[PDB]
Design a protein around this ligand. Structure first.
Ligand SMILES: Nc1ccn([C@@H]2O[C@H](COP(=O)(O)O)[C@@H](O)[C@H]2O)c(=O)n1
Length: 299
């Protein structure tokens, strides 16, 4: 009578940030990529709504209405005309406030788990609409694979990533608040005329060719300059992973996690070991993508 759903962390292979909109979000164009660093969420019927967390953020992560999974349970229950009487257990590998949208993964997982738990038969298009109400990254956590995100990031068009791509992720000592990083890119742009990414075409071509070596120099994230402004030590992490043999390093999302694309699974084993020995980040992970979006794995 429990349903467990796995939802992936993401890395933005490409992230162009536009103007601040009326709604307080920035317009953006991104290429989301789902990776095997995931959260597992177990949902059970219960007498009241509750959340518990182990893994990343075990000491740390709020379990009240601050948690996006709370709001996901309330929203889904309301959609289907029921009370959100479910216990939610989150076993987290996605770093907290790390740029990989772990709270969004958890919220996506709750939608899918409650759908199955209750056999509510709510369709993908409707789960997508609910996800978009919860946050800009929640729809991608439902969708998974690799996708072109537009609008605020909630509008998705699937793209082909025609291989397995091999990653090392370097978790930082702390976290960054996503709104501070967007404020900082705005500040940097008020001040100067920093470089903007080219169009996504070439990067999308490299993905469709399945070619990590071609993809690597095309990766780019316009928030990286903001994350590095706030946390300049991330330059040491980027430099270390690259020197260890990564094809490329980029900050993931709003940071401060650093992502390193490698040529093969064996290459990532080597890069992760060298990076762990370098003394420049908190802890290191190996992963691959693309992986599926939020999916039931038990129950
Ligand atoms: N497209 C986006 C997405 C997020 N943001 C910033 O990040 C914050 C968190 O966004 P989400 O709640 O959608 O995750 C927003 O309140 C906003 O400050 C943005 O400015 N533009």
């Amino acid at each position: 009578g429990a349903v467990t759903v796995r939802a992936p962390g993401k890395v933005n292979l490409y992230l162009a940030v536009g103007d601040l909109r009326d709604d307080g979000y920035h317009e953006l164009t991104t290429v989301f990529h789902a990776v095997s660093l995931a959260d597992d969420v177990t949902v059970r019927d219960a007498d009241v709504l509750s959340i518990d967390v182990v893994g990343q953020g075990e000491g740390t992560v709020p379990t009240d209405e601050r948690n996006l999974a709370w709001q996901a349970a309330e929203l889904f229950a309301d959609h289907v005309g029921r009370a959100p009487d479910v216990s939610i257990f989150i076993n987290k590998d996605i770093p907290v406030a790390g740029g990989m949208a772990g709270g969004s993964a958890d919220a996506a997982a709750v939608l899918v788990a409650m759908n199955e738990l209750w056999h509510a038969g709510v369709p993908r298009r409707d789960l997508h609409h609910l996800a978009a109400q919860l946050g800009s990254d929640v729809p991608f956590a439902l969708h998974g694979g690799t996708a072109l995100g537009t609008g605020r990031g909630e509008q998705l068009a699937t793209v082909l990533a025609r291989n397995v791509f091999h990653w090392v992720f370097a978790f930082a000592d702390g976290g960054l608040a996503t709104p501070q990083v967007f404020k900082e890119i705005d500040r940097l742009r008020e001040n100067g005329d920093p470089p903007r990414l080219a169009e996504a075409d070439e990067l999308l071509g490299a993905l469709a060719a399945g070619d990590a070596r071609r993809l690597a120099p095309l990766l780019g994230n316009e928030l990286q300059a903001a994350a590095v402004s706030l946390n300049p030590e991330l330059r040491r992490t980027l430099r270390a992973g690259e020197s260890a043999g990564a094809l490329a390093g980029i900050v993931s999302g709003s940071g401060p996690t650093c992502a390193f694309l490698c040529t093969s699974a064996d290459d990532a084993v080597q890069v992760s070991a060298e990076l762990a020995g370098a003394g420049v980040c908190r802890t290191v992970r190996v992963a691959s993508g693309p992986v599926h979006g939020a999916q039931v794995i038990q129950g």
